[PDB]
């Protein structure tokens, strides 16, 4: 699986950066959220504890899976802004 970043936006009204990317993975299943987040943090040199993956969407009959994620400057702002369900899904919140 190869990750290619299609768009980076710097939102500072909310202290975050929005990342739109794609995963090229022919002949393989949809990558797990853990693996996607790990590779994204490794490539972008981000903080693992202040980044979330909004979604990883696999299309029909395609080897490209689209992906949307965010990276926050501060964990406090991350918790304040992001919903609880997405944090639970990403595993940041033990719940």
């Amino acid at each position: 699986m190869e990750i290619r970043i299609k768009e980076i936006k710097e939102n500072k009204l909310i202290g975050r950066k929005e990342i739109y990317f794609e995963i090229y993975h022919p002949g393989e299943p949809t990558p797990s959220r853990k693996d996607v987040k790990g590779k994204l943090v490794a490539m972008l040199d981000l903080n693992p504890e202040t980044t979330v993956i909004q979604y990883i969407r696999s299309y029909f009959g395609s080897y490209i899976s689209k992906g949307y994620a965010k990276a926050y400057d501060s964990k406090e702002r991350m918790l304040y802004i992001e919903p609880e369900y997405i944090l639970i899904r990403d595993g940041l919140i033990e719940k």
């Binding site: 936006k9 939102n11 500072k12 009204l13 909310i14 304040y80 802004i81």
Partner: protein
């Protein structure tokens, strides 16, 4: 069956001047009463979320707004139902972005970037003039705002004139009169978003509105309503309207 004011607004019945998907959802933000009409206005939530994309959900849009990070004219607005209309300056001091709200050629409202120096000027068309207690003259503008002057300056202002007003301090910069050759910009009608210079003014009996002829930069002549004609300069536009 109807007993009082409405509090909801379906997306399929939203004003045609908005840039909104009319079938993605069922409910739209009902604009709160404010400066401009509902036809030439849009709730600030849609500007924060859809137009600029700073937010993905109404909740975080409200969270952004409550911190006073969005400025309209020169005042910080926190109500997400606040209407913003034509010839309004939306400023985001944290980003340095300044936009002017103007209608495009199809009558829809769009944000045109402007400069920091321009961000402190808001033209106002004198919609009406009357008298108040103490023998003072009150001018009512196109956006519902009001100003007061002494009887000494009675003749300095007339209906359909334009006033350049610094904001949010509300100081009078200058007065642009409405005569022949005055640069104007059409804000409504079939000729919306078209600019030119005044040529002639025609009046009719009864309450039928007066009609003004305008000449565009290409020399073509068209017509519109005298109230639709918005003065923006004497010979050239004092503000950017592309």
């Amino acid at each position: 069956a109807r007993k009082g004011p409405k509090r909801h607004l379906k997306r399929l019945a939203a004003p045609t001047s908005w840039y909104i998907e009319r079938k993605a959802y069922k409910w739209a933000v009902r604009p709160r009463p404010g400066p401009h009409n509902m036809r030439t206005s849009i709730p600030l939530l849609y500007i924060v979320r859809d137009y600029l994309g700073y937010a993905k959900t109404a909740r975080e849009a409200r969270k952004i707004l409550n911190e006073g990070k969005f400025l309209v004219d020169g005042r910080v607005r926190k109500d997400y139902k606040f209407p913003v209309g034509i010839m309004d300056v939306v400023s985001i001091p944290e980003t340095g972005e300044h936009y002017r709200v103007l209608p495009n050629r199809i009558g829809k409202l769009i944000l045109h970037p402007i400069s920091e120096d321009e961000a402190f000027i808001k033209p106002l068309r004198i919609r009406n003039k009357r008298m108040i207690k103490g023998a003072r003259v009150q001018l009512n503008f196109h956006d519902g705002t009001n100003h007061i002057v002494s009887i000494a300056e009675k003749d300095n202002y007339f209906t359909s004139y334009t006033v350049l007003m610094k904001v949010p301090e509300r100081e009078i910069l200058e007065v642009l009169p409405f005569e022949k050759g005055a640069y104007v910009f059409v804000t409504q009608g079939k000729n919306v978003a078209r600019k030119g210079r005044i040529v002639e003014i025609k009046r009719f009996p009864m309450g039928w509105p007066d009609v003004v002829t305008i000449e565009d930069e290409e020399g073509e002549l068209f017509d519109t309503l005298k109230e639709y004609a918005f003065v923006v300069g004497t010979d050239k536009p004092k503000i950017s309207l592309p």
